[PDB]
Design an enzyme around this catalytic site. Structure first.
Site, PDB file in Angstrom:
ATOM      1  N   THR B 261       0.776  -1.178   0.064  1.00  0.00           N
ATOM      2  CA  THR B 261      -0.011   0.087  -0.053  1.00  0.00           C
ATOM      3  C   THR B 261       0.796   1.265  -0.084  1.00  0.00           C
ATOM      4  OG1 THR B 261      -1.784  -1.219   1.166  1.00  0.00           O
ATOM      5  CG2 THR B 261      -1.778   1.206   1.346  1.00  0.00           C
ATOM      6  N   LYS B 262       0.518   2.245  -0.861  1.00  0.00           N
ATOM      7  CA  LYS B 262       1.141   3.647  -0.738  1.00  0.00           C
ATOM      8  C   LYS B 262       0.356   4.328   0.393  1.00  0.00           C
ATOM      9  CE  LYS B 262       2.002   7.488  -3.548  1.00  0.00           C
ATOM     10  NZ  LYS B 262       2.301   8.638  -2.461  1.00  0.00           N
TER      11      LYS B 262
END
Lengths: 263, 601, 44
Positions: B261-262
């Site tokens: 995930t960013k």
DNA sequence: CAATGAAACGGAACAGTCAG
DNA sequence: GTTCTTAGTATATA
DNA sequence: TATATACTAAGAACTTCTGACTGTTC
């Protein structure tokens, strides 16, 4: 204008060797004339409008001090409420011995530039915090062409002077005295707001008056009512008052301190 | 004892910069800077001829003022620049010069160039002179910064008085450019680094210290052996390029990879030596005052000092910074209601890489060795410090599934990184790739809204209206057209300049000056007001793609658009075909403000 | 000088460093009566 | 002859200041 | 709230 | 029993937080 505002007049004299010892005859002297004018107007302003602001600042001198540490500018006494401590400072220069003191303390009169001079006076007006009702600059010079030699200086002079005319500040010269060279269309028709060798405008600054004034002010605003329903707004103003001497203040004998009566 | 900059007048640097700017070619700019630096170093050798701290820094901090870090921020850009020049020059407050300075973007061929405008205002005004050298220039700039930090506007004005008075028109032009930190030389900063030294750019990428670059790399022939990241030294973090989803496996050398995930926060790096900690932002600015230099001070350091293993003395960490909600055990995305660099939320640091362990530099080790070192150097504290958990994958289908999962979780995107990639500071890509829903065509819910305001541009887009105020309509009765519009957001990107020029020519005859005391009835305004407004019937619909809808106190809709840009100029649509507040509310409520809620197939 | 203590003075022209005149007296302990009352008798 | 890189900009949001 | 500006209220001399 | 000065007593013409800005940052 805004009542709490106050009138502010700054004094600015040509300190060059030009008029320091012009003295064509032996009956007057332009510096002894300009300083006399300054002393007279300033002592009159003492009693007249003690709430106002005055300042004296010479240009072209050899010693230096000002707000910005420039060249050939001397702020003798800054803008502040008038007082005797400066009556004496001005009086210290009145005299042939006094002019000797002035020259050997600040200078014979070096090179100068009225562009930078107006710069300095503008900074002086900017500095003080009280609101100003009117702002007037008095030059004291008779070198009707400040410099016919460096045109760039003169161009910078029109520019800065026009700026001062648009920052809310007026400027004024009285042509004091010069052998010839007694004209205002030479570089000054665009500065100040026919001509001769002496200014009537400086003679009245010797009229040496001790009046006092209070500006446009109500004694009391009351609502004039024609009947029980129609009411109009009337300002009861005063046009003759029978001025009394300013009320004295009690001083402790010897400290000269205020004594704060405590009945 | 003395310095060369004391002997190099500022007019010489101004002449060199003017020649570089007027040069049409990279070769000509390069050769100008050739003569300047060669004469400088010859004078340096002659002046010293024998320990030394003097270097090219006094001039290079002026040539590249955006990289200045020793000097604090001036607090002055174009606006108080114009105001201070008006006040110090005592210009007529309603005069032509003062109004042009205060409205430099409004044309009256140099609109939007405060440099040209101030230069032309000052050229007749102050033919000022007497050769200020580089180090007086530096000292006056230092005085301005120190007075801004010391809350002395009067002393700022004083210093600017000496600067204005004792410098010429061209010199003051360049001074204004250096204060703005934008010279428009037409030459690239990496060009200037390859100029100064073959290792200048590389040393900068790990130091963020212009003085250090000049001091160690003064001699063009003496090159450093092993340039690497050092403790308490701000290094430029490495970035991620936009990934090609169809070629993702090929971009990753056809071998296994990680997907993650960013995080939506702020980039931050940590430097630890026992109890002393230092923190540097992405641009290299220090925020140790907020975060904590000691385990007894700061919002993070007291909560993290015990998370490290007992043998962890020196540690440099690279990670993302976000705010943690203790009640809901979730992360509040960066943006509204908080600033993580200035704070019932708690401070939480998620670390995804390490660069330094006690005596082992970890820049050149593989990201897998680095991650194994992360997993052992400290014990995570949930909500205070966590390990950014890299999830293994080998196929493009896994990438697509993870992107869809991020979309469902209302996340920004996913990071996909090469296992065998080394840390390459200030490098976009080279192992790190970034994927977002907005990078995929069709997954996006875009907005067709109406232009209602206009603003004048600056710089390369000066002299024309580079950006606009946009609004949404009220739902009209059937058969009728909307009459009242509610502003939503400002947009000024997405169109080629030819398209912008075409739109400006089309709309020029319809723009009306905006009066705050007399606004138009058809266009209501929030806190944000446009410079010029256009009646809706004469305006143009623009298709807008933006990351999400976020709350706003500047637009009447109660919300604005995050990362907005124009996708198309909808000439095929009429002005009355703009969406309504009902459509805006539907889009806002579809996915909790996120405008990306469709899977990729 | 411990002599000029207990003696009251009024130094009120002399501008010689006028203000320093009292300072010169102060170190002699002269009781400056900075404005003369009936208590002081000598005024300089 | 153009893909690849930057640099330049465009807001987004924050807070301290100054005016009033 | 500060300063001011009145007044007017008082007292003292032949 | 005057008028003159002092005093003090009061009233009025002079402040009162909030908004906006610019940077600064990303």
């Amino acid at each position: 204008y805004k009542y709490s505002g106050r009138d502010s007049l700054i004094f600015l004299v040509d300190a060059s060797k030009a008029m320091f010892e012009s003295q064509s005859e032996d009956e007057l002297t332009p510096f002894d004339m300009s300083i006399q004018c300054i002393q007279s107007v300033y002592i009159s302003k003492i009693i007249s409008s003690d709430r106002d602001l005055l300042a004296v600042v010479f240009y072209g001198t050899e010693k230096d001090k000002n707000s910005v540490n420039f060249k050939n500018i001397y702020v003798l006494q800054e803008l502040d409420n008038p007082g005797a401590k400066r009556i004496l400072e001005l009086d210290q220069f009145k005299g042939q011995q006094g002019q000797k003191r002035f020259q050997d303390m600040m200078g014979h009169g070096s090179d100068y530039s009225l562009s930078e001079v107006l710069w300095v006076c503008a900074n002086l007006f900017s500095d003080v915090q009280f609101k100003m009702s009117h702002k007037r600059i008095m030059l004291f010079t008779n070198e009707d062409n400040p410099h016919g030699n460096d045109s760039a200086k003169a161009s910078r002079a029109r520019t800065k002077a026009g700026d001062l005319r648009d920052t809310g500040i007026f400027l004024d010269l009285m042509h004091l005295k010069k052998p010839g060279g007694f004209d205002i269309s030479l570089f000054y028709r665009d500065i100040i707001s026919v001509h001769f060798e002496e200014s009537s405008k400086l003679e009245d600054l010797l009229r040496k008056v001790r009046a006092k004034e209070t500006r446009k002010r109500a004694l009391s605003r009351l609502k004039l009512k024609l009947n029980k329903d129609i009411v109009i707004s009337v300002g009861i103003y005063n046009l003759v008052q029978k001025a009394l001497k300013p009320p004295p203040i009690k001083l402790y004998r010897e400290t000269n301190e205020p004594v704060k009566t405590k009945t | 004892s003395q310095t060369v900059a004391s002997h190099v007048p500022f007019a010489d640097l101004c002449s060199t910069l003017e020649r570089i700017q007027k040069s049409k070619g990279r070769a000509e700019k390069i050769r100008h800077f050739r003569e300047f630096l060669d004469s400088w170093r010859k004078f340096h050798d002659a002046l010293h001829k024998n320990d030394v701290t003097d270097s090219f820094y006094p001039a290079m901090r002026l040539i590249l003022p955006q990289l200045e870090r020793e000097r604090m921020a001036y607090g002055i850009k174009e606006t108080m620049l114009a105001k201070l020049y008006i006040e110090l020059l005592n210009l007529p407050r309603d005069g032509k010069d003062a109004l042009k300075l205060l409205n430099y973007r409004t044309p009256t061929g140099d609109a939007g160039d405060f440099a040209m405008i101030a230069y032309f205002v000052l050229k007749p005004r102050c033919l000022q002179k007497g050769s200020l050298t580089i180090q007086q220039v530096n000292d006056l700039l230092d005085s301005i910064a120190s007075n801004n930090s010391a809350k002395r506007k009067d002393l700022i004005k004083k210093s600017l008085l000496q600067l204005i008075t004792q410098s010429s028109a061209l010199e003051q032009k360049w001074l204004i450019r250096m204060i703005i930190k934008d010279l428009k030389l037409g030459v690239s900063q990496q060009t200037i680094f390859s100029v100064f030294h073959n290792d200048a750019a590389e040393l900068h990428n790990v130091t963020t210290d212009l003085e250090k670059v000049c001091r160690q790399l003064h001699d063009p022939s003496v090159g450093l052996s092993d340039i690497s990241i050092t403790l308490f030294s701000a290094f430029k973090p490495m970035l991620a390029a936009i990934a090609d989803i169809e070629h993702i496996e090929k971009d990753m050398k056809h071998q296994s990879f990680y997907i993650e995930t960013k995080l939506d926060g702020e980039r931050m790096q940590m430097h630890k030596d026992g109890d002393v900690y230092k923190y540097f932002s992405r641009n290299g600015y220090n925020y140790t005052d907020q975060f904590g230099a000691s385990p007894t001070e700061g919002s993070l350091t007291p909560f993290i000092h015990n998370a490290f293993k007992a043998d962890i003395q020196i540690c440099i960490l690279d990670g993302e910074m976000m705010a943690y909600n203790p009640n809901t055990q979730t992360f509040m995305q960066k943006g509204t209601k908080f600033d993580i660099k200035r704070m019932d939320l708690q401070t939480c640091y998620c670390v995804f890489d390490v660069l330094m362990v006690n005596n082992k530099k970890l820049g050149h080790e593989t990201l897998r060795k680095r991650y194994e070192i992360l997993s052992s150097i400290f014990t995570p504290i949930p909500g205070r410090i966590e390990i950014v958990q890299k999830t293994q994958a080998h196929t493009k289908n896994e990438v697509i599934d993870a992107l869809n999962e991020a979309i469902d979780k209302r996340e920004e995107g996913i990071m996909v990184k090469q296992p065998l990639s080394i840390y390459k500071p200030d490098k976009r890509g080279e192992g790190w790739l970034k994927i977002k829903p907005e990078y995929v065509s069709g997954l996006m819910d875009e907005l067709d809204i109406l232009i209602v305001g206009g603003y004048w541009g600056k710089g390369s887009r000066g002299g024309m209206m580079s950006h606009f105020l946009c609004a949404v309509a009220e739902k009209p009765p059937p058969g009728e057209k909307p009459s009242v519009f509610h502003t939503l957001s400002r947009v000024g990107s997405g169109c080629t300049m030819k398209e912008l020029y075409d739109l400006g020519l089309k709309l020029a005859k319809y723009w009306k000056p905006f009066h705050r005391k007399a606004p138009p009835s058809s266009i209501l305004c929030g806190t944000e007001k446009p410079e010029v407004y256009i009646e809706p019937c004469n305006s143009v619909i623009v298709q807008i793609k933006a990351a999400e809808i976020v709350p706003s106190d500047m637009y009447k809709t109660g919300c604005t658009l995050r990362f907005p840009r124009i996708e198309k100029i909808r000439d095929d649509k009429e002005w009355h075909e703009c969406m309504t507040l009902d459509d805006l509310e539907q889009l806002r409520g579809k996915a909790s403000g996120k405008l990306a809620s469709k899977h990729l197939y | 000088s411990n002599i000029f203590e207990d003696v009251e003075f009024c130094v009120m022209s002399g501008t010689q460093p006028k203000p320093d005149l009292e300072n010169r007296i102060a170190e002699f302990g002269g009781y400056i009566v900075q404005n003369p009352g009936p208590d002081t008798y000598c005024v300089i």
